[model samples]
Target: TEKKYIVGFKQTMSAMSSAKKKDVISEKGGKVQKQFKYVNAAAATLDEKAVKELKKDPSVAYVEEDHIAHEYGKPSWLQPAQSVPYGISQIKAPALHSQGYTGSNVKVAVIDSGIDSSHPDLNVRGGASFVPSETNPYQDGSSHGTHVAGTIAALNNSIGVLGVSPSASLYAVKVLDSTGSGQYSWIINGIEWAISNNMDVINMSLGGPTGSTALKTVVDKAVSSGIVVAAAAGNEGSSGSTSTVGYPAKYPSTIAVGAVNSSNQRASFSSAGSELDVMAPGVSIQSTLPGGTYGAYNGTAMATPHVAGAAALILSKHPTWTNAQVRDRLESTATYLGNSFYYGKGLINVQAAAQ
Candidate 1:
């Protein structure tokens, strides 16, 4: 699906100036808030009234909508494989047999498409299905959640890819339905349940176009409970446009991650904005899938867990580190990319953070 961008006037005067500055007439009634804006110059340089008025301007470019750019890159398997490039494994898991940090005993709750706990790569400890009850929690009906779990603690089996924290336990909390769509209520419920269980980390790889009060409140509670929550910054890349960021990720307490390629450039689809907190390898990532198969997919969905896995790794080592401490260390040790929207604090240097 093609994504659109929208410009919101800070005040009515700003909208007016934008309309006048752009020499455009305003539209009638302004019922077209969802219309797609022109790819370039999609913003209204005027006040709200002017912007609403400018919507009628023939000379003005298209109005901004809540749209995001698609990521353009190869899948992880298509690219060359690399060991945990971050510093975590250098001294920690110096050898494959070294159980530097199993992430063992620590529980990570995943909220997304159902998981294939049977997948040889993941620890299926226990999970619940919130979709319809008729759905199977053991199948990767949607594939997204399974992929995310694989990134977090895919078993350390020598046969397949190893997860960032091999020993960490997993709890599958399926919020997204088979259609890949779920109400905000379902997501909020998932967060609450994870917290009630005292989960150490909660991985949210799904997001939508807007936010709600319920979602924000639950997210706030999860943070208050010392649960580390990680979310996708979105797939909308930066082009100096006004893009929408998915909620929970936008919440100040959550760790919002954008996607970058192996070369460290922001993935065209990775969402960028003032809310982004970190960057990770999101494009073309290969991880565990259903039926003992492996596949590569791309999106902020894939990038989020790289950090989640890292979080698990950190917890395994410094069990005493508070959630805030883990977050601070991860951001401080990140490889800064300099582009505010692209890389945030920089790429997560797992190897460095591990030490």
Candidate 2:
């Protein structure tokens, strides 16, 4: 009976007014799921019949079914690794690891498909879920979040690859499902969850073609609240033509990261634009996968967590630093490549950030 819908209003709705909207849905046999402070909108789940009733209301500006999103990176090739993903080495994270600035106690929320709770390599602290009616938020049916998490904070255990922040606490905020499908409401819920919990950094490795101002409002709020948000630039580029970076990342205040290969060349699949802020290894980079396995993936998704982990490391180093300081350190420390469109400021340098 519960179906997701975005409830829009004519002007910015206040808490009291939004509560009035909630009452309407409740009276119509629907349950309110989320409320938006910006964009004058909210999302709810209701019966099909209740949907028609809500749409008929004169106060309602518009009603749209929530938009769905997918994992930005797809598994292109699988390359096994014993330990220490190349991205860690490429960014010199081991230097920080040796210096004991390995993201200790820093909280990173990976808002993605899900995380493999059973993965022994990650120090998962616990998490919340936005996937409706799905109680087990920690269970990762798809391997995308697991891989992304591994890149950010897989433990320094000898058996598996080391993460960018080996000691940081990982929170698996499952917003997407097994097939890497999720709605905008789910993602908004995930970001709200992270902010409510005072998470230090949020890693979003998923994106969509359409840019949403409502999403930008939430992202801006998170950044203003001192949470460092890093996102994938999206994987829609080709040798024939460059792809504009996608939403969330395209939104300013987000540390948009692009994909690079072992040769420090931009990956053909990595999106390009002025929105991009940095680049990291994302081409066939090896990391932890589901079922205690390791594999390589290609996309800005893989590149995103590296910057997120680096942000965690910086936050660990300067606990009193603001989110702006965190961004300054990471972007200023990156090795400036010639092309900003392709590489942003440049590839991230963890050692420089630590120093």
Candidate 3:
């Protein structure tokens, strides 16, 4: 009546090789089943008589019954089927992800409506509100800013949809009101706050039709100070040749983003103009929403964060690179999807930019 057991050798037996350890078990009339390389031990089938005798041996460390171990099922928090948003993969963020660039330590400012600070999928560092009545940057009433934040830096945990830069630091610079509208002064203040805090990247999904000299001056200062700024190209595409790219985005310093669908076709409502810098997925795009929820939204607003997130990834890899260097790498490495007037440099290939 033999049973499976594990026999260990003492430290004093360190001079003995694995073969010697097996020989010690063999001399006990035990048939060795396996030898462990890590520990001076061996698994064997031995009777109670041999176990008792082995324990008495000075060379033997310990002798015990061998037990079977089975792996437990995954925990409740682990989501094996976590959904990957189409836009994230469309821009090749995952390619850079495999190379260990998840945008860790990069700071990004979402200058729009507030963010849901309590959301598990988002990693908001901190922020301030420029809105008058609503002062909490964490309390997102419009859900727009939260959605945009998720696209930029939602956690990579196996739960909600993954973001472009899953580990980037997100700061909520609330300028838009609950209705998603804000004054020029509100946006200017938000920009100033981002600049004062030395944010690495600023994402402004909100824009206006008319230009403001004050807004232009502030945006220029932000870019000149080494912040990579990205804004929506507006949702006013038309058949005419006239430019529809909105203010702030129309300014030379900011990267104006347009929208595209899964098939890489231009979205009908995606604004176009000479100033447009890049195109990103926007149609039926799924991302995080406020109150621990998620939904699909459309517009150039969705496209802008893809650029911001891409910049975060690029900056994370080349920490010493300036905003201009990052922007130049992005534009030069992009895959041209259409005319310059519509797609700017075209769809940003983050994988190429990072490499």
Candidate 4:
């Protein structure tokens, strides 16, 4: 059987000569489909004879099979005009978007109350449910997970709010139930699933006061396995003094995220702690809700996705970067807000991270 292949000619042998490369492939009974100018390579349909001959050709560099590319999800149409959220601009995501760094093909798992499969603004690529009764990850009973998903990756096209990483692939790993509540085990299962599936990033917009050794172990494992885990720093801030940052966010392996309002100032309720990693827009943040609607909600939950989406954007721009490097780039490039306890590494600057 014939197969498609991308064949390249050695630079020294081809010497910028497209004709010479094409001549060799044609002589080998290989059907040339396309040719390139900058590189001496050709897309061709190769038979067994061509394959055997090309491997023996002294001038040939390598012959790689041209694999089929299956499309992930449906393309969203650019509607009348997109409502650019204030947060999107605040983090300078547009700077990267303008240069086409929209987090395409990056996998971001929304480990929360699930994502609304029917929501027009969300493209739930794949999902799983850790909740007891809810088996479908796409069926979000609470609008919380759906909301977080939007802030991370609402479609770039018409009629809704844009996300930090607009083109990121959103996965619904439903750990919380409809009441927006969940057990530690449920969250652990979700993390294990994310690790097993090889998700690029995990957004846990839920947290509690009690810490668990098992939870910490799983979260640590996920990070060590190369998944960027972004969790919410609890909303238990005392404007005066106290460490209120919660559970998983308090874990060293996770990126603990605090909240800031529209002005980029720390939200009054945002938790503070030495463990806090970063701040992002949270108060009155507008995002997608269940039932194909949009509304403004407030919490450190809202802020977590901003960092998660920002990680996606950075990974999209530099796919080779490790999870630690992504976190470092974000921290190193952040614009300082105030205290490290209140703002962690301050508000994230996606533009600087991508650069």
Q: Which candidate's lDDT is highest? A: 2
**Regions more than 4 Å wrong, model 3:** 1-81
TM for candidate 1 is: 0.73
What C-alpha lDDT does candidate 3 achieve relative to the native structure? Answer: 0.83
Please identify model 4 stretches exceeding 4 Å from their true place. Answer: 1-81, 239-241
Clashes counted in candidate 2 amount to: 1
Q: Which ten residues in a row are the worst by lDDT in model 1?
A: 32-41
Candidate 1 global CA lDDT score: 0.67
Q: Rank the candidates by lDDT, best first.
A: 2, 3, 4, 1
Deviation (Å) of 18 in candidate 3 = 83
Candidate 4 has a TM-score of 0.77
Model 1, residue 161: distance off in Å is: 1.0
The sequence of per-residue lDDT tens digits that candidate 3 reaches over residues 235-353 is 88855789988878898899989998889988888888898888998887788887787777887888889999999999988999999999998889998997888788889899998
lDDT by residue for model 2 (130-218), tens: 88766466788778999999999887766778889888989999998877878888888898888989899999999887766567768
- Return the TM-score for each candidate structure: 0.73, 0.89, 0.77, 0.77
RMSD of each: 11.1, 3.3, 25.8, 16.9
Q: Using alpha carbons, what is the TM-score of model 3?
A: 0.77
After TM-score superposition, the amount by which residue 219's alpha carbon in candidate 3 deviates from its true location, in angstroms, is: 0.4
